[PDB]
């Protein structure tokens, strides 16, 4: 069995190996990468996502989200308060202000320490989930707006034709902006490219141990657990590495820098934070190996998780028994 300790693997494809996206994912899995839940892919030196970022300040963040925390430093939830629209140029200036900027620090470890110590005492503003792409249309390799669609994968594997579309999303971050513990919708893969700016630190639980994290989460968030049998789908709960280590939960951590891709694998729980002003692009995708995970994915039916149009068909075809109750949640 490859990668039996479930370590995060880092890949350095050549320009030749960067041509065929599906093939390279399957290669990484042949080496055991999926067992970690997360992999890093460093693009060949010849590749670029686009020529420059000099012209992005006019993108609109229609609904910036102020991430307000409740709880204790190592175990908290966050709620998203909607703020007035602002441009990326306005957001960048905000991120760089004295109130929101990254503090002085020695290295990534010192910054990680300061994040876990102090996150809860601040409310950083996140421009999340903005439909769009920063890949140049002429970038032919690993262009996250040109991937094969999940609908087409399901059709190729299972024969059924379904409605729905699959497009990327932009994320504009600042110091302390936080992504809560989650897996993807329908336990899909994700791919995330850090276009510019400061790093993103990731934490991940191997897929084979995801239920251990769920059981801890039910213990740590007991009212939330009573409210919903899949409350991590709400994407609000944070648990620190120190607390994970105290409770024996297997995990790994890695920091992504600008110019790097990360892939999350089906049912790989992940969480993290941004080090300063940055812009990431991410999209879900599927492979044949995902289908079985899609069939078994939990679902939020309490009504809180409220997701995309395209998830309907996935539930309807892969989980027909759950369909009815899940759609009651969405309506
Ligand atoms: O970058 C972020 O804020 C969150 N991204 C993801 O969870 C992902 O790419 O799967
Ligand atoms: Mg612009
Ligand atoms: Ni994710
Ligand atoms: Zn729910």
Swiss-Prot record:
Post-translational modification: Ubiquitinated via 'Lys-63'-linked ubiquitin chains. Deubiquitinated by USP14 with the help of TRIM14 leading to stabilization.
The keyword Transcription regulation is annotated on this UniProt entry: yes
Keywords: ADP-ribosylation, Chromatin regulator, Dioxygenase, Iron, Metal-binding, Nucleus, Oxidoreductase, Transcription, Transcription regulation, Ubl conjugation, Zinc
Cofactor(s) needed by this chain: Fe(2+)
GO molecular function annotations of the record: chromatin DNA binding; damaged DNA binding; histone demethylase activity; histone H3K9 demethylase activity; histone H3K9me2/H3K9me3 demethylase activity; metal ion binding
Every JmjC domain range: 136-302
Start and end residues of each JmjN domain: 8-50
GO cellular component, one term: site of double-strand break
Superkingdom: Eukaryota
EC number(s) recorded for this UniProt protein: 1.14.11.66
GO biological process per UniProt: cellular response to ionizing radiation; chromatin remodeling; double-strand break repair via homologous recombination; inflammatory response; positive regulation of chromatin binding; positive regulation of double-strand break repair via nonhomologous end joining; regulation of gene expression; regulation of protein phosphorylation
Protein name per Swiss-Prot or TrEMBL: Lysine-specific demethylase 4D
Organism: Homo sapiens
Gene: KDM4D
């Amino acid at each position: 069995a490859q990668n039996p300790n479930c370590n995060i693997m880092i890949f350095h494809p050549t320009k030749e190996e960067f041509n065929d996206f599906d093939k390279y994912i399957a290669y990484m899995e042949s080496q055991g990468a999926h067992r970690a839940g997360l992999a890093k892919i460093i693009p060949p030196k010849e590749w670029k996502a686009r020529e420059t970022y000099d012209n992005i300040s006019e993108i609109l963040i229609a609904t910036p989200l102020q991430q307000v925390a409740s709880g204790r430093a190592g175990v908290f939830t966050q709620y998203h308060k909607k703020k007035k629209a602002m441009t990326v140029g306005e957001y960048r200036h905000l991120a760089n202000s004295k109130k929101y900027q990254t503090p002085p620090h020695q290295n990534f470890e010192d910054l990680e320490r300061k994040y876990w110590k102090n996150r809860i005492y601040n409310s950083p503003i996140y421009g999340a989930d903005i439909s769009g792409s920063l890949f140049d249309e002429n970038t032919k390799q690993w262009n996250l707006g040109h991937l094969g669609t999940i609908q087409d994968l399901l059709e190729k594997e299972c024969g059924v034709v379904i409605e729905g579309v699959n497009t990327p999303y932009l994320y504009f971050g600042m110091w302390k902006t936080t992504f809560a513990w989650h897996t993807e919708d329908m336990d899909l893969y994700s791919i995330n490219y850090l276009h510019l700016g400061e790093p993103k630190t990731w934490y991940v639980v191997p897929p084979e141990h995801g239920q251990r994290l769920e059981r801890l989460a039910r213990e740590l968030f007991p009212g939330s657990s009573r409210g919903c049998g899949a409350f991590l789908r709400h994407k609000v709960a944070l648990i620190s590495p120190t607390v994970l280590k105290e409770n024996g939960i297997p995990f790994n951590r890695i920091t992504q820098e600008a110019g790097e891709f990360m892939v999350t694998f089906p049912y790989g729980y992940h969480a993290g934070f941004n080090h300063g002003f940055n812009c990431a692009e991410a999209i879900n995708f599927a492979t044949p190996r995902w289908i079985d995970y899609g069939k078994m994915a939990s679902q939020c039916s309490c009504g809180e998780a409220r997701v995309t149009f395209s998830m309907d068909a996935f539930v309807r075809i892969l989980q027909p028994e759950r369909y009815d109750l899940w759609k009651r949640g969405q309506d």
